[PDB]
From a paper:
The crystal structure of lmDegUDBD was determined by molecular replacement and was refined to an Rfree value of 25.3% for the X-ray diffraction data with a resolution of up to 2.39 Å. The asymmetric unit of the lmDegUDBD crystal contains two lmDegUDBD chains (chains A and B), which have essentially identical structures with a root-mean-square deviation value of 0.50 Å. lmDegUDBD adopts a one-domain structure with a tetrahelical helix-turn-helix (HTH) motif as observed for a LuxR-type DNA-binding HTH domain that belongs to the GerE (PF00196) family in the Pfam database. The lmDegUDBD structure consists of four α-helices (α7, α8, α9, and α10), and the two adjacent helices are linked by a 3–4 residue loop. In the lmDegUDBD structure, the α9 helix is the most elongated helix with 15 residues and forms a base frame that supports the other three shorter α-helices. The α9 helix is defined as a recognition helix, which has been shown to be required for dsDNA binding in GerE family members. The dimerization interface of lmDegUDBD (buried surface area, ~ 500 Å2) is mainly located at the α10 helix with additional contributions from the C-terminal region of the α7 helix and the α7-α8 and α9-α10 loops. The α10 helix is parallelly aligned with its equivalent helix from the dimerization partner (α10′; the primer denotes the second lmDegUDBD chain in the dimer structure) and is responsible for ~ 64% of the dimerization interface. To be consistent with the dsDNA-binding ability of lmDegUDBD, the lmDegUDBD dimer structure displays a continuous positive patch that is electrostatically complementary to the negatively charged dsDNA. Each of the three lmDegUDBD mutants (lmDegUDBDR168A, lmDegUDBDN198A, and lmDegUDBDR212A) exhibited lower dsDNA-binding affinity in the FP assay than lmDegUDBD, indicating that the continuous positive patch of the lmDegUDBD dimer covering the R168, R212, and N198 residues mediates dsDNA recognition.
Listeria monocytogenes is a pathogenic bacterium that produces flagella, the locomotory organelles, in a temperature-dependent manner. DegU transcriptionally activates the expression of GmaR and flagellar proteins by binding the operator DNA in the fliN-gmaR promoter as a response regulator of a two-component regulatory system. lmDegU contains an N-terminal receiver domain (RD; residues 1–143) and a C-terminal DNA-binding domain (DBD; residues 159–228), which are connected by a 15-residue linker (residues 144–158). Therefore, we conclude that DegU is a noncanonical response regulator that is constitutively active irrespective of phosphorylation.
Author numbering:
A (entry chain A): 160 to 228
B (entry chain B): 161 to 228
Write the structure that this text describes.
């Protein structure tokens, strides 16, 4: 399950990243600061045991946790 | 516009979709990281995106690369 390992906010960040949004775009969409976006990304890399956004995103797509809009 | 990427740029893009680092890509393709970094920089320029994640997600969307 995604929610066994991620929060809902983290799932939303991952989907917004899969959509192609930047840290600025994600914060705009979620009304959070860019630093906070990076904090969510930092947590996602920890929980998924990957080293950057791209591995996390490609892994989320691979497991069906997010979709290509 | 797939025609604008070189085959080598496509290989780097596929290796990025696989999850390899610039060190892994340089290892796999027997090139230096500086050469890999330039290929990445070139791919973002030709694709008109700002970072690796947008390039990879855009290539997946259009079927240029596959999830191994």
């Amino acid at each position: 399950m995604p929610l066994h390992i991620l929060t809902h906010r983290e799932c939303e960040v991952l989907q917004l990243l899969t959509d192609g949004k930047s840290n600025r775009g994600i914060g705009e969409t979620l009304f959070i600061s860019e630093k906070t976006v990076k904090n969510h990304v930092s947590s996602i890399l920890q929980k998924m045991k990957v080293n950057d956004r791209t591995q996390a995103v490609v892994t989320a797509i691979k497991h069906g946790w997010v979709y290509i809009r």
